[PDB]
Each structure stands twice: as structure tokens, then as C-alpha cells.
């Protein structure tokens, strides 16, 4: 669900 660092990369 965490594709990267930051809020913008949460599915």
C-alpha cells in the first residue's frame, strides 16, 4: 500500500 515516501504514495 506504500509505493513511496510521502502521503501521496499511499493506496
Amino acid at each position, epitope marked *: 500500500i*506504500h509505493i513511496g*515516501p510521502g*502521503r501521496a504514495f499511499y493506496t
Partner: antibody
Amino acid sequence: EVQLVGSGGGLIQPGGSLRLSCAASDFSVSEYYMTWVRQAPGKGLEWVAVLYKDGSQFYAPSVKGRFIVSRDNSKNSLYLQMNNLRGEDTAVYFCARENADYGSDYYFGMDVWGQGTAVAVSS
Amino acid sequence: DIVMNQSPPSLAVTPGEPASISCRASQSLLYSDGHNYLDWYLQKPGQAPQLLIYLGSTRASGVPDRFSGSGSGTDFTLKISRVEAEDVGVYYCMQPLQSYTFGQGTKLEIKR
């Protein structure tokens, strides 16, 4: 009192490795997103690494593949393993508790920071 | 690759006067969740950064009334209504949306 106290660090020759520690108080390091932010001498704030409760890890491009964020559920500590150190790394390292869970909606900023421990890469 | 631009680098203020620091993002720190993801931090000399305002406009637990954050989209403003001698330090803005990036910082000085 809720706080982060970090330690380790000091002088370390170029190429060498070094582990920064940081220990929580009155909260579990396994229960919050945690971040490592550094600050080069005179220069400003640079983010370095984040470790999500949701297992995962991601790094600033400048360091990726040299640093590692680990926690210890029993020692209640956050760790920053720093490998193959360039002078570009000498700075003050702050661990910080990002009081947020993107799972739910909530977010509350970098809630808690450590006093900051200094690293000096040098011959 | 979100970039923040802080204005000004420095500003002097007399205690009692208002101050106002600006942060300007490369993209919109407005997220589809209906929130503004930008923070404001104070770094008093030789200390760790302390949080002032999260979610663009919400003051943290303990922060004085005098601090207020406004803005939306890509332009933002931290405002101190009445500066005190102890508000001296460096103010940084950070976005936690795409990676984690900080403004260049803003040195607040007191006039006396």
C-alpha cells in the same frame, strides 16, 4: 515525558560505516511512521529516510543504497545504519516521529524530534 | 520532484509588529482527500526543529495563538500576529506529499 533521545555518531573515516541509535519514551517506535532528517553545517534541513509502521522503507536519492532504517520492537529504538560514508554526509542527524497514519486519514506533523547527533566524515 | 521556495531569506521585526513568511510549492500540496499537506517548523538556534503548523493551517498542541498558517494550492503563508523576543530562529516549511522537502528557511531577527 514523550521524547526521542539519539546517540552514536561521532567521527568516522570516509568509506567507513556507522550506526545511529535513537530511543523512544512513552510511545512505541513500532506504532508510528518514523523519519531521519539531517542538516549539513550551516545549510538547512534535508530528509533522509522514512520507516513506516506498515513495514516499508524509502530513502532520499542522495543516500539510497547506503543507509538503512531498522527498528527494534523490544529495545524501542530506531536505527540508521550508514554505510560507505562520503564527506557529503557529515551533518547533524535528527530522528523524528511523523505522527501520521495514511491508513486512516489523520496526520499531525513531525510531532517529536530527537536532540540530534553529529556525524563527521574525515580522514 | 516538488520544490519549495521560501520568502524572504531574512526579515527583522520589532516585538509587537506582525511578521509573515511565504512558502511557494512547485505543485499543489492540495491532495484529493480535501486537505493541504504543508507544515511549518521553528528551529531555535542549536535545537531540533519544533512543529508549529501541520496540514497547512492547523496549529499544533502547545503552539501559541499568535501563530497561524494560511494558504492553499501552491502558495502558503505563515503569520505571526505579534512577534516576541523568543520567536527568533529559523522558520522552515515542509511538504510530506512527494518525498519530504523543506524550504530554504527564513531567519527571523528581533529589532531592539
